[PDB]
Amino acid sequence: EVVGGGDLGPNVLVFDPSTPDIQGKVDEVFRKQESNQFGTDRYALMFKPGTYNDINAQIGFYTSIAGLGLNPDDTTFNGDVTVDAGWFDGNATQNFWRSAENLALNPVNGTNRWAVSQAAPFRRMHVKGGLNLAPDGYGWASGGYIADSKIDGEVGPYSQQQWYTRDSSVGGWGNGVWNMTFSGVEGAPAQSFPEPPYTTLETTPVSREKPFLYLDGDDYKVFVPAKRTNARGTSWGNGTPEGESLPLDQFYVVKPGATAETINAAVDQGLHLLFTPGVYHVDQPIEIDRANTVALGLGLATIIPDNGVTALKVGDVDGVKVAGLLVDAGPVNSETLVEVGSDGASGDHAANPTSLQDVFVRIGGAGPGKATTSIVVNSNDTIIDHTWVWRADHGEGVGWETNRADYGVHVKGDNVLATGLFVEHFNKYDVQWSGENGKTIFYQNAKAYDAPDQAAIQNGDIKGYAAYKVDDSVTTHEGWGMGSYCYFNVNPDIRQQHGFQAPVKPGVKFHDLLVVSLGGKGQYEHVINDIGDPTSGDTTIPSQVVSFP
Ligand SMILES: OC[C@H]1O[C@@H](O[C@@H]2[C@@H](O)[C@H](O[C@@H]3[C@@H](O)[C@H](O[C@@H]4[C@@H](O)[C@H](O[C@@H]5[C@@H](O)[C@H](O[C@@H]6[C@@H](O)[C@H](O)O[C@H](CO)[C@H]6O)O[C@H](CO)[C@H]5O)O[C@H](CO)[C@H]4O)O[C@H](CO)[C@H]3O)O[C@H](CO)[C@H]2O)[C@H](O)[C@@H](O)[C@@H]1O
Ligand SMILES: OC[C@H]1O[C@@H](O[C@@H]2[C@@H](O)[C@H](O[C@@H]3[C@@H](O)[C@H](O[C@@H]4[C@@H](O)[C@H](O[C@@H]5[C@@H](O)[C@H](O)O[C@H](CO)[C@H]5O)O[C@H](CO)[C@H]4O)O[C@H](CO)[C@H]3O)O[C@H](CO)[C@H]2O)[C@H](O)[C@@H](O)[C@@H]1O
């Protein structure tokens, strides 16, 4: 039998305000992680409730930072949680895989800088000042995700291409570049697409905040927020948040050495899962087939499936909460990397859905990796709240065949909701949606850069594969604030027929679509189906469609 609870290990650094040389300790981690884009090192920085002076916590690759109070203002920095782009000469477009949660910031010059691109969530934060999302110098940046946060002053994206904010409060919002989408944000700018490109929804249809580690006195627990319907503003602004607390001893604390056999045994025996920061090779799928299981990763905990197996399979049960995990493909092709529900699953989970939150997938980049379909969502009512599903475009083990990955996300279940959907560079369809009444709020895609020629992406009678395809048989679907970009740098004579493909039906609707050619490297012929202007020139001007059909 598996023993629950226990020590969190050497990769969880726990601070309190009396800890000697905090600034030195977080600086040493940053120096190691700053340019460590593909290394296997992992860190979670955890701060006990209290007030911390004279701190500038710079956050590098694979570093999470968080407070351990029940509320964000319980753990306050007089100081900053900083991401900048110094290591990449002011270019922030590779600032991936890091996170900040459950802290209050009093930034030293009045504005906190969080200049990130994909897979860098900012959750349950209170910024007592402004929030600058751009690197110093206003260089390139491609984020981003803010949820359940309160920014007292102005959020300034400046150069940020696009952004998603949900269930939050902002004192102001400075500008929009290609696609700034908001749902349930108090203080959001009014709907105005295309100028500025603001897509604004009064509420989020359903959301359930990500579970997180905290301290109840001296005891570690995991808070599990209750879901909200038609959510707006923060969950924590008005007193004790709704939800339940799980004692650490009800978790199997996963550390280096654990096997999928032991992990699966823990779940069968009734334990939840806490993945401590590290890299976990498994030789069989991790299986979660118990209702309400929490599977929570710290410090960008990473699962690698060996032998071509699937990394994670969730059964046909209510309430599973998967959060804060990177799934990294192995060199042997996996048919699937993540499965939510069985094939053909038709039960409903409306009152208590399964969710994936801050679940990131990588294929290649840290060595060759391959997978046919990365995430398959079978279970009805599933919530996908911030995912980055990424076929690597740079790094080691990358190439049109070397890290081939045909399909990113396939949604087969009904009433599935995706909020903050980022999917890039797959050889065929990045996202396919076959289930009914699906909803996507915010989509960011970039197409494969390394397609060798036109013939390599021929899709029957269509040039290229849509970034986002709704199956012809679908009756109801709706999407808001969605963009697909191309950069066919291997062969810039390539044409991509469209970013989006869907049947023309009254129940299948899109709002605020765009496609963009990055510097004239390839062009789009249309935005969706054969509708919308082609892109033209080398000046990276979006082609837009406000309403479809
Ligand atoms: O790297 C691997 C990674 O790649 C990703 O794809 C890359 C993709 O991100 C990249 O796209 C480029 C794109 O970012 C860029 O967008 C620009 C945008 O930067 C620009 O911002 C302006 C700001 O410059 C300006 O700053 C103002 C400042 O000048 C002034 O001095 O002060 C002002 C404040 O006082 C300040 O505001 O501010 C304005 C708003 O006021 C911003 O609009 O805006 C332009 C549009 O105007 C926008 O185009 O454009 C480039 C082309 O020019 C894009 O190339 O492209 C790469 C390929 O070249 C991609 O690789 C993928 O997503 C990842 O998966 C990969 O791993
Ligand atoms: O003390 C509290 C503040 O802490 C800051 O953290 C510091 C962090 O930002 C800093 O990173 C350095 C990078 O900014 C630097 O990147 C270069 C840019 O500075 C530069 O910009 C210039 C611009 O300053 C000038 O006004 O205009 C120029 C023309 O437009 C423009 O070029 O662009 C460069 C590319 O051309 C770019 O490389 O790179 C440095 C070297 O790596 C980084 O050190 O690092 C500090 C030391 O560690 C951090 O303390 C927060 O960012 C603030 O929010 C806090 O207030």
Short mmCIF file of all heavy atoms in Angstrom, two decimals, residues 333-371:
data_model
loop_
_atom_site.label_atom_id
_atom_site.label_comp_id
_atom_site.label_asym_id
_atom_site.label_seq_id
_atom_site.Cartn_x
_atom_site.Cartn_y
_atom_site.Cartn_z
N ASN A 333 7.18 7.18 -31.20
CA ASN A 333 5.87 7.78 -31.42
C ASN A 333 4.78 7.20 -30.51
O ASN A 333 4.60 5.99 -30.44
CB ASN A 333 5.44 7.64 -32.88
CG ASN A 333 4.19 8.45 -33.21
OD1 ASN A 333 4.27 9.67 -33.39
ND2 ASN A 333 3.04 7.78 -33.31
N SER A 334 4.09 8.09 -29.80
CA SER A 334 2.90 7.72 -29.04
C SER A 334 1.66 8.00 -29.87
O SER A 334 1.53 9.08 -30.44
CB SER A 334 2.81 8.51 -27.74
OG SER A 334 3.85 8.13 -26.87
N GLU A 335 0.75 7.03 -29.93
CA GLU A 335 -0.52 7.24 -30.65
C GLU A 335 -1.30 8.42 -30.05
O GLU A 335 -1.88 9.22 -30.78
CB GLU A 335 -1.36 5.96 -30.60
CG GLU A 335 -2.57 5.97 -31.50
CD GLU A 335 -3.26 4.62 -31.54
OE1 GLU A 335 -2.71 3.65 -30.97
OE2 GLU A 335 -4.35 4.53 -32.14
N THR A 336 -1.30 8.51 -28.73
CA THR A 336 -1.87 9.66 -28.00
C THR A 336 -0.98 9.98 -26.81
O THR A 336 -0.30 9.11 -26.30
CB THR A 336 -3.28 9.39 -27.46
OG1 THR A 336 -3.25 8.25 -26.60
CG2 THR A 336 -4.26 9.14 -28.59
N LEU A 337 -0.97 11.24 -26.38
CA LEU A 337 -0.21 11.61 -25.19
C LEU A 337 -1.12 11.79 -23.98
O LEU A 337 -0.77 11.37 -22.87
CB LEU A 337 0.60 12.90 -25.42
CG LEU A 337 1.77 12.77 -26.40
CD1 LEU A 337 2.41 14.11 -26.65
CD2 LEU A 337 2.80 11.77 -25.87
N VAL A 338 -2.28 12.41 -24.19
CA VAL A 338 -3.25 12.59 -23.11
C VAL A 338 -4.64 12.22 -23.60
O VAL A 338 -5.07 12.70 -24.65
CB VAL A 338 -3.27 14.05 -22.58
CG1 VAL A 338 -4.35 14.22 -21.50
CG2 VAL A 338 -1.91 14.45 -22.01
N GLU A 339 -5.33 11.35 -22.86
CA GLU A 339 -6.72 11.01 -23.18
C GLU A 339 -7.65 11.35 -22.03
O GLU A 339 -7.41 10.92 -20.90
CB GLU A 339 -6.87 9.52 -23.50
CG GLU A 339 -6.13 9.09 -24.75
CD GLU A 339 -6.28 7.61 -25.06
OE1 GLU A 339 -7.16 6.94 -24.47
OE2 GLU A 339 -5.51 7.11 -25.91
N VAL A 340 -8.72 12.08 -22.31
CA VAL A 340 -9.70 12.38 -21.27
C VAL A 340 -11.01 11.68 -21.59
O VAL A 340 -11.79 12.11 -22.46
CB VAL A 340 -9.93 13.89 -21.12
CG1 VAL A 340 -10.88 14.16 -19.94
CG2 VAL A 340 -8.60 14.62 -20.92
N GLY A 341 -11.23 10.56 -20.91
CA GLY A 341 -12.39 9.73 -21.16
C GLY A 341 -12.10 8.67 -22.20
O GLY A 341 -11.13 8.77 -22.96
N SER A 342 -12.94 7.64 -22.24
CA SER A 342 -12.80 6.56 -23.21
C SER A 342 -13.39 6.94 -24.58
O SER A 342 -14.22 7.84 -24.68
CB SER A 342 -13.49 5.30 -22.69
OG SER A 342 -14.89 5.51 -22.60
N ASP A 343 -12.96 6.25 -25.63
CA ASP A 343 -13.54 6.46 -26.96
C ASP A 343 -15.03 6.12 -26.98
O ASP A 343 -15.43 5.01 -26.61
CB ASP A 343 -12.78 5.61 -27.99
CG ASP A 343 -13.22 5.90 -29.41
OD1 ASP A 343 -13.57 7.06 -29.72
OD2 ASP A 343 -13.20 4.96 -30.24
N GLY A 344 -15.87 7.07 -27.39
CA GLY A 344 -17.30 6.85 -27.44
C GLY A 344 -18.05 7.10 -26.14
O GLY A 344 -19.25 6.84 -26.05
N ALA A 345 -17.35 7.62 -25.13
CA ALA A 345 -17.96 7.95 -23.84
C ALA A 345 -19.15 8.90 -23.99
O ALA A 345 -19.03 9.96 -24.62
CB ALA A 345 -16.92 8.56 -22.91
N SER A 346 -20.30 8.55 -23.42
CA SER A 346 -21.50 9.36 -23.62
C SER A 346 -22.23 9.73 -22.33
O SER A 346 -23.37 10.21 -22.37
CB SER A 346 -22.48 8.63 -24.55
OG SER A 346 -22.03 8.63 -25.90
N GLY A 347 -21.59 9.51 -21.19
CA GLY A 347 -22.15 9.97 -19.93
C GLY A 347 -21.96 11.46 -19.81
O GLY A 347 -21.13 12.04 -20.51
N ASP A 348 -22.70 12.10 -18.91
CA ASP A 348 -22.55 13.53 -18.73
C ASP A 348 -21.87 13.85 -17.40
O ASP A 348 -21.93 13.04 -16.47
CB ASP A 348 -23.91 14.21 -18.84
CG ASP A 348 -24.56 13.98 -20.21
OD1 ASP A 348 -23.92 14.30 -21.23
OD2 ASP A 348 -25.69 13.45 -20.26
N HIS A 349 -21.22 15.01 -17.32
CA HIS A 349 -20.49 15.40 -16.11
C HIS A 349 -20.73 16.86 -15.78
O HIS A 349 -19.80 17.57 -15.36
CB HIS A 349 -18.98 15.14 -16.30
CG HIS A 349 -18.65 13.75 -16.73
ND1 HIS A 349 -18.51 12.70 -15.84
CD2 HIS A 349 -18.42 13.23 -17.96
CE1 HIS A 349 -18.21 11.59 -16.51
NE2 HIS A 349 -18.16 11.88 -17.80
N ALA A 350 -21.96 17.32 -15.97
CA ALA A 350 -22.20 18.77 -15.99
C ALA A 350 -22.03 19.40 -14.62
O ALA A 350 -21.47 20.49 -14.51
CB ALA A 350 -23.60 19.07 -16.53
N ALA A 351 -22.51 18.74 -13.57
CA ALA A 351 -22.45 19.31 -12.23
C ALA A 351 -21.01 19.34 -11.71
O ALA A 351 -20.63 20.21 -10.93
CB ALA A 351 -23.35 18.52 -11.27
N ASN A 352 -20.20 18.38 -12.15
CA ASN A 352 -18.84 18.23 -11.65
C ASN A 352 -17.90 17.72 -12.74
O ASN A 352 -17.56 16.53 -12.80
CB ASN A 352 -18.82 17.28 -10.44
CG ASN A 352 -17.49 17.28 -9.72
OD1 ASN A 352 -16.69 18.20 -9.90
ND2 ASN A 352 -17.25 16.26 -8.91
N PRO A 353 -17.50 18.62 -13.65
CA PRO A 353 -16.72 18.19 -14.81
C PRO A 353 -15.27 17.86 -14.48
O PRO A 353 -14.77 18.23 -13.42
CB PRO A 353 -16.79 19.40 -15.74
CG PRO A 353 -17.02 20.55 -14.87
CD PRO A 353 -17.83 20.05 -13.69
N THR A 354 -14.62 17.17 -15.40
CA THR A 354 -13.17 17.00 -15.36
C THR A 354 -12.55 18.21 -16.04
O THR A 354 -13.14 18.77 -16.98
CB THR A 354 -12.76 15.67 -16.03
OG1 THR A 354 -13.09 14.59 -15.14
CG2 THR A 354 -11.26 15.64 -16.34
N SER A 355 -11.40 18.66 -15.55
CA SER A 355 -10.71 19.80 -16.14
C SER A 355 -9.22 19.53 -16.34
O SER A 355 -8.61 18.78 -15.58
CB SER A 355 -10.87 21.06 -15.27
OG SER A 355 -10.37 20.88 -13.95
N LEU A 356 -8.68 20.13 -17.39
CA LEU A 356 -7.24 20.25 -17.59
C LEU A 356 -6.85 21.72 -17.46
O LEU A 356 -7.38 22.57 -18.18
CB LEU A 356 -6.81 19.72 -18.97
CG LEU A 356 -7.17 18.28 -19.36
CD1 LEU A 356 -6.57 17.98 -20.73
CD2 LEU A 356 -6.66 17.30 -18.34
N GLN A 357 -5.94 22.04 -16.54
CA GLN A 357 -5.53 23.43 -16.34
C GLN A 357 -4.01 23.52 -16.29
O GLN A 357 -3.39 22.73 -15.60
CB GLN A 357 -6.11 23.99 -15.04
CG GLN A 357 -7.62 24.15 -15.07
CD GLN A 357 -8.17 24.59 -13.73
OE1 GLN A 357 -8.20 23.81 -12.78
NE2 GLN A 357 -8.58 25.86 -13.64
N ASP A 358 -3.43 24.48 -17.01
CA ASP A 358 -1.96 24.57 -17.12
C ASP A 358 -1.37 23.20 -17.44
O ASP A 358 -0.41 22.75 -16.80
CB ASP A 358 -1.35 25.13 -15.84
CG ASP A 358 -1.82 26.54 -15.53
OD1 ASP A 358 -2.34 27.21 -16.44
OD2 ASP A 358 -1.67 26.97 -14.37
N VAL A 359 -1.97 22.55 -18.42
CA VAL A 359 -1.44 21.31 -18.96
C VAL A 359 -0.79 21.65 -20.28
O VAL A 359 -1.43 22.20 -21.19
CB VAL A 359 -2.54 20.23 -19.12
CG1 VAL A 359 -1.98 19.00 -19.82
CG2 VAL A 359 -3.13 19.87 -17.75
N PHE A 360 0.51 21.41 -20.37
CA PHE A 360 1.28 21.77 -21.54
C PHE A 360 1.82 20.52 -22.18
O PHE A 360 2.17 19.56 -21.48
CB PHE A 360 2.40 22.73 -21.16
CG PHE A 360 1.95 23.84 -20.26
CD1 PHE A 360 2.48 23.99 -18.99
CD2 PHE A 360 0.97 24.72 -20.69
CE1 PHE A 360 2.04 25.03 -18.14
CE2 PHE A 360 0.51 25.76 -19.85
CZ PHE A 360 1.05 25.90 -18.58
N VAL A 361 1.85 20.51 -23.51
CA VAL A 361 2.38 19.37 -24.23
C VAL A 361 3.50 19.86 -25.13
O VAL A 361 3.37 20.91 -25.77
CB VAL A 361 1.30 18.67 -25.08
CG1 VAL A 361 1.90 17.51 -25.85
CG2 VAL A 361 0.14 18.18 -24.18
N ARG A 362 4.60 19.12 -25.15
CA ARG A 362 5.70 19.43 -26.04
C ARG A 362 6.06 18.21 -26.88
O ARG A 362 6.15 17.10 -26.34
CB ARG A 362 6.92 19.90 -25.25
CG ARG A 362 8.18 20.00 -26.11
CD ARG A 362 9.32 20.68 -25.34
NE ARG A 362 9.83 19.84 -24.25
CZ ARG A 362 10.45 20.32 -23.17
NH1 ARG A 362 10.62 21.62 -23.02
NH2 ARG A 362 10.91 19.48 -22.24
N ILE A 363 6.24 18.40 -28.19
CA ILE A 363 6.75 17.31 -29.03
C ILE A 363 8.07 17.74 -29.67
O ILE A 363 8.08 18.55 -30.60
CB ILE A 363 5.74 16.91 -30.12
CG1 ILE A 363 4.36 16.64 -29.51
CG2 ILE A 363 6.26 15.70 -30.90
CD1 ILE A 363 3.43 17.84 -29.63
N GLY A 364 9.18 17.19 -29.18
CA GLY A 364 10.50 17.57 -29.68
C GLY A 364 11.07 18.79 -28.98
O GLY A 364 10.40 19.38 -28.14
N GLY A 365 12.30 19.17 -29.32
CA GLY A 365 12.90 20.40 -28.80
C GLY A 365 13.98 20.11 -27.78
O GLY A 365 15.02 20.78 -27.74
N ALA A 366 13.74 19.11 -26.94
CA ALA A 366 14.75 18.68 -25.98
C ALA A 366 15.24 17.30 -26.37
O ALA A 366 15.55 16.45 -25.52
CB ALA A 366 14.18 18.68 -24.57
N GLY A 367 15.35 17.09 -27.68
CA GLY A 367 15.63 15.78 -28.23
C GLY A 367 14.44 15.38 -29.08
O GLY A 367 13.37 15.97 -28.93
N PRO A 368 14.61 14.40 -29.98
CA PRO A 368 13.50 14.03 -30.85
C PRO A 368 12.31 13.50 -30.06
O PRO A 368 12.46 12.82 -29.04
CB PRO A 368 14.10 12.94 -31.76
CG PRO A 368 15.30 12.44 -31.02
CD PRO A 368 15.83 13.62 -30.25
N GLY A 369 11.11 13.84 -30.52
CA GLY A 369 9.88 13.38 -29.91
C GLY A 369 8.81 13.32 -30.98
O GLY A 369 8.86 14.10 -31.93
N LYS A 370 7.85 12.41 -30.84
CA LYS A 370 6.82 12.20 -31.86
C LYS A 370 5.53 11.72 -31.21
O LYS A 370 5.58 10.94 -30.27
CB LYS A 370 7.29 11.16 -32.91
CG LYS A 370 8.34 11.68 -33.89
CD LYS A 370 8.56 10.72 -35.05
CE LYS A 370 9.45 9.58 -34.64
NZ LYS A 370 9.69 8.66 -35.79
N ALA A 371 4.40 12.19 -31.72
CA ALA A 371 3.09 11.69 -31.30
C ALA A 371 2.05 11.99 -32.36
O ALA A 371 2.07 13.05 -32.98
CB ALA A 371 2.67 12.32 -29.95
#
